[PDB]
């Protein structure tokens, strides 16, 4: 049955016209099946037999009795845009715990909405002949596979659910694709009563809701998760055992494994990723190394762990703890009460051009903050492995505006600290190295060196080098040859940046070498001076 | 209603809604429900593909729609140089004025906006405006004949007071004593209710070079480095004689007696810096640019200009009480203060160069925004010298 609901005014993109796609010819076997399916839809009021007036047409096919398939790809190319049909999908950690939850499938089979009469002509299609005229039709309802159907379907369900919602504030209904999720904290019998009242309400609008045979029951499959009444678990992750792995297999496997590192602790893929080096074909077979076999082996075991979480309780605190798993790697878990996680996560190592750990910490805090607001509409209280004095010292001086929402210190190693802090003033009694480096940027031949106030000096010859690398190399040599306290003068513009940001990680192996050196010194003062 | 269109070839805004806090989502739902009843806005379908960000600010919540994009695409349509001279200016929010006025039926779809749903459990609530929206370029424009009429009396009554309107704001500027000023304001509010800036003080501070009993190699180094850079603003600045004392490989800490030539060079330089570079004038055909640098510990420096090194204005902003642990709070505060002065002075907002990471700012700025308008901004990496240089800006003898 069709619904007695107003139509939404649809239009075709700017100036474009309806499709005129030639009907792919079929076999007598397929035509008969289509002619049947279509006579059934014609009586239901879904399609209308139409004349030659219509210059438009969409191809119809036969798949599997037989099932009909209309290829609207072309209509969809010429159909106006709509408001992005709810793009962000719900995360189980944001679902409030409810006593009862029931799923109502309002799919197309059960849900038929009328089409904007003005637009119906563009949906025209033709059932071929055995040479002679074929049978022409057009849709009177939202076609399955057409661009606007998901949006108009959702908009319609919303209009229809408005009354019920105002009348049952103790009940919450979530919309996602063809399904309605209805939950409440009412007594199970009362809950069931309201579901039935709703079903009867959709029935009134032309929505024949489900069959006892098509009713979904707990747990629920929510994109890799299993939603149980009091908690969620994750659908088993299967790692195929083989004696022959191709590039494609390894990549797929890495893919599936990277997703698991989010929920599971200890997942590693370094040795499996190594297998991808120099690969010439996807089908190419790469023998697993010894370490890859072990890694894969240990992961199979980690995935046999019963990782579970719980649901949201708005009357309780929202807490998020963070750990540094390695340089640039951050792990986190958001919970309300100790050990009962709502959600856990990991942020792939960021390979910046140059940054520091405290900065990377704020970036993790910000990503979690954004995630939380989406999921819970609130920001968590943070537990960060950094002292309040370390934070104060860094942020207050840093050239860039930065911030962390309300947080507290949790002493869980390793802790994030400032690996070094350039002196504010020149060091008295410390050798002063005047460094300098130059190179022909074309020949890439250069020299680096220094001359200290104490008479010490050096110059190194470098081939295949840039001017930047020599200048930085100059600084590096001064750091090597100096004592634990050193003043260094340079006209390097990039060094000026180091004084400002004082990075502890970067893209240059050279800068990295310098940082290791900076860290090792007890005192370092960097002074920049204009060249010449 | 008068027909309003988009600039030629411009299509409507399709800006996505940022996530909001449950607090703000609840607030907007309540505000918008009441507005629907009063016929100011109406729910819309999915056939309307446009969208404009919306949010709530501030002890009850106010709805604030980010129309920057739409304002840009809206067809085009004077400034009282006297406002900037006045002793005191008070700012007033006159956005409610617009609700009465209807918006062309054909333009409404472009005002579409969405109230998001927590955890994406439900589709957002879509609306569009029926009447003039607060924050849109066209509103102050359309409601102009109506605004003059209501202002004529108060104006003609007090020809000494200047009143300037920007977006939803009204800047009232006069010369009366603080009390006589606040009194004139209510007389106006009453007049309106029936339907603390000080520009003369905003003095441009000069750059001051350090003076020392004795100078060290480093002292001169840092000094010469800044003067060199500054040579881009003032070509008469010289570092020759100073750079000579820097000959050799002395210890960064060694004291260097200054030659008489370096002493004079330092004196000529101080004199040049005594005043703002000559020949800088505001150009209406050009955009205003506001650059901010984080000096640290609550201090911020900014420069307003249109051409690099040709400042129209520069200044310092010290963080306000109760903003200590919040860099984002301090920056938005500063942005609003600078934008306000900009309006007062030129009647337009400047585009900002903010020393903050995109993600950091976009996540928290609305939490401390308090203006009806929103300026344009871009995120940047502060050059070390630009910071070191404006840090040299002069400050009060004892204070103020
Ligand atoms: C899974 C469950 C079963 C029972 S019951 N009736 O005892 O079997 C009671 C509560 C729950 N769940 C909860 O407490 C928390 O979960 C929920 C809390 C409220 C609502 Cl309305 C639905 C759920 C879901 O479990 C759920 C399941 C899905 F597949 C998809 C979605 C959605 F699309 F909305 F994201 C939500």
From Swiss-Prot, chain A:
Changing residue 69 to I: Confers resistance to HBY 097. Changing residue 44 to A: Confers resistance to lamivudine. Residues 427-532 form the RNase H type-1 domain. Changing residue 84 to G: Confers resistance to pyrophosphate analog PFA. The record marks 433-434 as: Cleavage. Residues 44-227 form the Reverse transcriptase domain. It comes from the Viruses. Mg(2+) 2 binds at residues 436, 471, 491. Changing residue 208 to Y: Confers resistance to zidovudine. Changing residue 183 to A: Confers resistance to efavirenz and nevirapine. Error-prone enzyme that lacks a proof-reading function. High mutations rate is a direct consequence of this characteristic. RT also displays frequent template switching leading to high recombination rate. Recombination mostly occurs between homologous regions of the two copackaged RNA genomes. If these two RNA molecules derive from different viral strains, reverse transcription will give rise to highly recombinated proviral DNAs. This is Reverse transcriptase/ribonuclease H. The chain holds residues 588 to 1126 of 1435 of the full protein.
